[PDB]
Design a protein around this ligand. Structure first.
Ligand SMILES: Nc1ncnc2c1ncn2[C@@H]1O[C@H](COP(=O)(O)OP(=O)(O)O)[C@@H](O)[C@H]1O
Ligand SMILES: Nc1ncnc2c1ncn2[C@@H]1O[C@H](COP(=O)(O)OP(=O)(O)O)[C@@H](O)[C@H]1O
Ligand SMILES: N=C(N)NCCS(=O)(=O)O
Ligand SMILES: N=C(N)NCCS(=O)(=O)O
Ligand SMILES: [Mg+2]
Ligand SMILES: [Mg+2]
Length: 716
């Protein structure tokens, strides 16, 4: 196989902005210098290994010119393997082959759990010693390999009797039937092609199929052999045993390449070790719809794969589920993990289907309350309001309940269950605060530090915008970078961004963007739908502290990134002193900011903007809780006044900082908001409480708070 010089290949890969491969990562100048003239014992080169990465930016891994590539270019492959298979401290290791004691082995049929499994499949790969892969085979040696393999296949015992169908002179209608029946590989794998997988096609290739049609072998496609066991239903025990017996019989007729570090050698580094992939095709549309679906799979040791294109137009929800691991465990370990992980996922799909029977369409489905309650147990009952008030009495009273429009208690604790460092819930609609009042009301009192709960949250009280109890603090630029004040609002009649539907978002955005487009004067500006905004535009505004971020796991697991990015947007005036996030955590976030410390100018611009917006829609509001929001922490005024405060460096004593914080009902966030760290010792310094006080008071408790936190400056 003739390819470009290794150094050309490295340039192409490196200058390709789209390439994010492990090849790119580890194909270093040192590596290229060390290996550029080196040949394997079968005549292969590192260039032949990485060729495909140069022409397919999407591929994550290299391939191998032949089985000796792993040893000959070890500095390169070990790095790639250690990373991909997540090997601890790069001590790559693989245990001796072990399928288990077949006569005593039994796994429950996977259709026990909701009867969702169309079919079950297990496959292995093997390399035969003394032969190269695509880059280093000749036409005649590939045919010799093919003959050696088919010969051993014909000598297989009774259950494995069948027919070998070479790919050469097989009709295009037989081939296309076999592929759709899930029996045969496809033709169109560009990664494989540019790795040399289709040289001299179709000679030396074929498929073996037994009479029963539940065991089959691919010769010289992606590996020397791919050995496959499969049938309808969820009978994994039978599928596994059939595979294991076949490969043990074949092991006596063929010498398979095996490595003490890497296990069985394969063409792609992804398949080293067991090479074993045990899979089901299962109907799991609700589990598949969850925000953290992939991570839930990963956590159970399972990789999900789509099946899009394998069915008619209206067939959905069918996924390939398999053990993610290959390397550093036995075959028995692998299929056991597959079986435990898939069972758990399938059971979770049954629980979701039961628990969300009858819920509104497009509304996020949720795990059962007692399931999420158990995950929440990894959170601290002293820091986490979400857990502290989720008592056994609460679960008993509220499990099974829905608001009028479908919100549950399970919904609002879900972000906490999956992000145990998070400390507040995220509600689904305004009606949550009455429906689930026994849980939310004492949490609300605790967080906001209500002292006399006999009284209403004050009516909206913004004060006289002409004579304010603060003015320009007027600093230098020594402590305060930028002054900012924001409020959240909800629109009556709409579910919150957590569980609202796509169609809801489209209608909400229309209401709000309409009002925003009509703002005049200092508040006149442009609305930017996230659907039309470029990725470097968006990231600039985010790093400029103007736009909300799109990768917060806590908001993601609460439902807030569903149907992304439909109905999300940023509005701002030309100066960017006034801004509105449409449908992030809340329906609205109305923001005023500028460089400097002039809180009064910032505050005034904010209040004027709120009133103008409020002409076109009714904000959700209660006597007890004031302006209602997604998170209970943002009730009342829903107001957060803040500056980014360079305190070099009271950070030095983060307890002199935490004391000076608890002492004002103020909160410390990172440079880029909550759940971020602070370089520079620069701190997001805001008033903590928003309920049980007016908008003037909230901003004054901040002013006094910062005025004082500053003053412990160069007395230091
Ligand atoms: N559990 C299963 N039941 C039926 N067919 C399957 C199953 N798992 C995989 N397949 C089929 O195998 C073929 C190739 O799948 P692929 O994802 O490349 O798996 P592998 O890498 O193990 O060959 C496709 O037709 C796919 O539908
Ligand atoms: N005083 C400030 N100056 C500049 N940016 C700020 C200030 N306060 C908050 N931000 C930014 O606003 C964004 C929102 O983050 P977050 O902490 O979630 O605040 P909220 O959601 O209450 O608006 C973040 O990028 C944060 O860095
Ligand atoms: N083809 C296999 N075996 N894995 C996919 C890796 S890659 O094509 O993304 O490099
Ligand atoms: N409501 C927001 N964004 N944060 C509350 C604090 S936490 O729940 O994210 O820990
Ligand atoms: Mg495949
Ligand atoms: Mg936020």
């Amino acid at each position: 196989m003739q390819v470009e010089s290794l150094q050309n290949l490295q340039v192409k890969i490196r200058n390709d902005e789209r390439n994010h491969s492990l090849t790119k990562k580890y194909l270093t100048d040192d590596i290229v210098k060390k290996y550029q003239a080196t040949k394997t014992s079968l005549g292969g080169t590192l260039a032949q290994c990485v060729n495909t990465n140069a022409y397919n930016p999407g591929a994550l891994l290299p391939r191998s010119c032949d089985l000796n590539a792993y040893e000959t270019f070890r500095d390169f492959f070990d790095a790639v393997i250690a990373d991909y298979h997540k090997v601890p401290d790069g001590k790559i290791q693989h245990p001796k082959s072990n399928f288990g004691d077949l006569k005593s082995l039994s796994f429950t049929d996977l259709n026990t759990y909701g009867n969702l499994v169309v079919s079950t499949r297990v496959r292995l790969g093997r390399t035969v010693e003394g032969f190269g892969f695509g880059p280093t085979l000749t036409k005649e040696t590939r045919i010799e390999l093919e003959n050696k393999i088919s010969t051993a296949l014909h000598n297989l015992s009774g259950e494995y009797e069948g027919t070998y169908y070479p790919l050469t002179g097989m009709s295009e209608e037989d081939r296309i039937k076999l592929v759709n029946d899930h029996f045969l590989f496809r033709n169109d794998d560009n990664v494989l092609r540019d790795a040399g997988g289709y040289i001299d096609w179709p000679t030396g290739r074929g498929i073996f199929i037994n009479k029963q049609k539940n065991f089959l072998v691919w010769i010289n496609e992606e590996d020397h052999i791919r050995v496959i066991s499969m049938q309808k239903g969820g009978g994994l025990t039978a599928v596994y045993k059939r595979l294991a017996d076949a490969i043990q019989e074949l092991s006596k007729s063929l010498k398979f390449a095996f490595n003490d570090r890497l296990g069985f050698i394969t063409f792609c580094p992804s398949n080293l070790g067991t090479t074993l992939r045990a899979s089901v095709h299962a109907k799991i549309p609700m589990l598949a719809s969850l925000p953290n679906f992939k991570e839930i799979c990963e956590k159970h040791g399972i990789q999900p794969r789509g099946t899009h294109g394998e069915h008619t137009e209206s067939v959905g929800g069918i996924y390939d589920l398999s053990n993610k691991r290959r390397l550093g465990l036995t075959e028995l370990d692998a299929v056991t993990e597959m079986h435990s992980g898939v069972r758990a996922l399938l059971e979770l799909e049954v629980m979701l289907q039961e628990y969300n029977k009858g819920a509104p369409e497009g509304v996020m489905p949720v795990e059962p309350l007692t399931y999420l309650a158990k995950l929440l147990e990894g959170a601290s009952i002293e820091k986490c309001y979400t857990r502290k008030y989720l008592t056994p009495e609460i679960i008993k009273k509220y499990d099974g309940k829905r608001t009028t429009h479908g919100a549950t208690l399970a919904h609002m604790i879900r972000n906490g269950a999956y992000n145990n460092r998070s400390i507040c819930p995220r509600t689904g609609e305004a009606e949550c605060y009455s429906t689930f009042i026994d849980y939310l009301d004492p949490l609300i009192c605790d967080y906001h530090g209500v002292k006399d709960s006999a009284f209403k949250h004050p009516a909206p009280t913004f004060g006289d915008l002409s004579k304010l109890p603060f003015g320009d603090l007027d600093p230098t630029g020594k402590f305060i970078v930028s002054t900012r004040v924001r409020v959240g609002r909800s629109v009556e009649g709409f579910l919150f961004p957590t569980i609202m539907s796509k169609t809801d978002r489209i209608k909400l955005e229309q209401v709000i963007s309409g009002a925003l487009k009509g703002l005049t004067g200092e508040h006149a500006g442009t609305y930017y739908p996230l659907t039309d905004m470029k990725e470097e535009d968006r990231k600039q505004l985010v790093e400029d502290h103007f736009l909300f971020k799109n990768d917060d796991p806590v908001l993601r697991d609460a439902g807030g990134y569903r149907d992304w990015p439909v109905g999300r947007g940023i509005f701002h005036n030309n100066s960017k002193t006034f801004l509105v996030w449409v449908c992030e955590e809340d329906h609205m976030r109305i923001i005023s900011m500028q460089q400097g410390g002039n809180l009064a100018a910032v505050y005034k611009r904010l209040i004027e903007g709120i009133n103008a917006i409020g002409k076109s829609m009714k904000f959700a509001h209660s006597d007890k809780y004031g302006y209602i929001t997604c998170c209970p922490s943002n009730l009342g005024t829903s107001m957060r006044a803040s500056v980014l405060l360079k305190i070099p460096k009271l950070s030095s004593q983060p307890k002199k900082l935490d004391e000076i914080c608890a002492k004002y009902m103020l909160q410390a966030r990172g440079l880029y908001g909550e759940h971020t760290e602070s370089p520079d010792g620069t701190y997001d310094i805001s008033n903590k409480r928003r309920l049980g006080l007016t908008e003037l008071q909230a901003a004054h408790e901040m002013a006094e708070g910062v005025a004082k936190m500053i003053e412990i400056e160069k007395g230091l």
